[PDB]
């Protein structure tokens, strides 16, 4: 039996470092005989906005619009916007979901945040109860491949940006673990733009090299302790 | 003299607790005689995607598109998209910037993240020489008024979601403090949808009552210690 992988890619330039890290992941996982799918958000012109346009049926409460309530109802009625269900198909089938993106304000670019806001709706990604360890997407693995402008030193506890794990909290714990995902150690390619042609090559290579044994990896303990120590 | 306030509002329903919190802020601050501008992102159908459309005219390098470089250059060249420059005018003129938004995946809704990604460009909000305490928007006050689905106990250090100060990090420190903003204590209205009408009123009331003395407030020490330490 093989493995299915969904790569949610968020970058505008194919020739970029992120483009390379995404292409390299495609190459390597393809080479492994893995089933690979790529959601090139910018090319898809993915709708980041959570609006009533995401529902197609009779709103549960057309007097007072509540996105969460409405999307959960739409999901259960199969009346969500198609672009959302398409993504949910990709995720539903994936064994691993990789997010390739540059760090935008200690987080993911808006287009990617929209992906998370709209795709990971109630009923599909989680239920109440049914989150964190009980997340509907339990059994799946998720990994953040992040490129940064700041340096590794800047992202240390005593660095000006604080520990790199600090900003991973909302994405890894708040979003992924909440949905049931098991989180693999993040792949951070620090300050590519500052790096030399050689160092860049090494960063790209290291990612491919790591993917060779990605199926053997254990997930990180997605806890407050892992992120903040104490 | 006088105090200018820019409220960046991100919610789809006017009749919502979020709308009420925004309306109350408008009321109170307008009553105080302050200058108030509101950016109703959803009504404005604000563009969250960071693309090459954000630059008008000839790109510094159309062969390889680099958002950060292109925008920064376009800023100095006065070639940015009007929707971005409009918001920058409001920001530049404001003394206090209030962000009113529901918590979406331990962060801000994508439409609001988009505002931050595109509006707070290099050359305007920050630049290599100036960031954090030296940010280009140094002197202004910033406040995050967020509503949560989770209860106050869930947002404790040993709670499922962890301490609320953990998710605040990328927002307050990574974004706001980075741009030079003085950060005022965040206003967090825990689980409004779960609260009673009495509790909700108490919530909206404390917010307005707080607004009565906002100008006398001391900004919090936006440090790693403040968010994670003891
Ligand atoms: C709105 C915004 C917010 C930001 N917020 C932050 C923040 O909070 N924190 C932070 O640290 N940074 C931040 N930055 C910076 C951002 O994280 C970096 O600019 C980004 O990660 C750089 O990645 P890139 O793929 O765009 O790089 P590139 O500019 O592509 O840099 C890579 C260089 O390598 C070349 N290259 C590409 N592929 C390869 C390859 N395979 N081998 C060799 N060379 C190659 C490229 O052509 C280029 O010369 C922000 C920037 C913006 C626009
Ligand atoms: C994509 C997505 C991701 C999410 N991620 C998170 C997350 O990470 N963490 C988390 O905890 N939650 C999350 N939520 C949930 C969300 O944060 C909350 O449900 C939301 O903040 C509730 O605020 P509201 O203003 O929309 O509430 P409302 O639906 O408006 O609830 C307020 C209630 O008070 C009534 N009301 C309005 N005005 C007043 C007034 N003045 N006085 C009295 N009553 C009034 C309203 O009509 C309603 O009955 C997420 C939701 C979505 C859709
Ligand atoms: Zn976790
Ligand atoms: Zn800070």
From Swiss-Prot, chains A, B:
Q: What PANTHER family does the record tag this protein with?
A: NAD P H OXIDOREDUCTASE-RELATED (PTHR10204), RIBOSYLDIHYDRONICOTINAMIDE DEHYDROGENASE [QUINONE] (PTHR10204:SF33)
Question: Where does the record say this protein resides?
Answer: Cytoplasm
| Cofactor(s), names only, from the UniProt record | Zn(2+); FAD
Stated name of the protein: Ribosyldihydronicotinamide dehydrogenase [quinone]
Source domain of life: Eukaryota
Q: Would you tell me the Gene Ontology cellular component terms?
A: cytosol; extracellular exosome; nucleoplasm
What does the UniProt function comment say about this protein?
The enzyme apparently serves as a quinone reductase in connection with conjugation reactions of hydroquinones involved in detoxification pathways as well as in biosynthetic processes such as the vitamin K-dependent gamma-carboxylation of glutamate residues in prothrombin synthesis.
Its recorded reaction(s) are: 1-(beta-D-ribofuranosyl)-1,4-dihydronicotinamide + a quinone + H(+) = beta-nicotinamide D-riboside + a quinol
How does its activity get regulated?
Inhibited by melatonin, resveratrol and 5-hydroxytryptamine.
Instruction: List residues binding substrate.
Output: 126-128
What keywords sit in the KW lines?
Cytoplasm, FAD, Flavoprotein, Metal-binding, Oxidoreductase, Phosphoprotein, Zinc
Task: Using the UniProt record, give the first listed, main subcellular location.
Answer: cytoplasm
InterPro entries referenced in this protein's UniProt entry, alphabetically:
Flavodoxin_fold, Flavoprotein-like_sf, NAD(P)H_dehydrogenase_qn
Q: What's the further remark here?
A: Uses dihydronicotinamide riboside (NRH) rather than NAD(P)H as an electron donor.
State a single Gene Ontology molecular function. zinc ion binding
Residues holding Zn(2+): 173, 177, 222
| Documented EC number(s) | 1.10.5.1
The record's listing under Pfam families reads: Flavodoxin_2 (PF02525)
Q: Kindly state what the record says about how the cofactor is bound.
A: Binds 1 zinc ion per subunit.
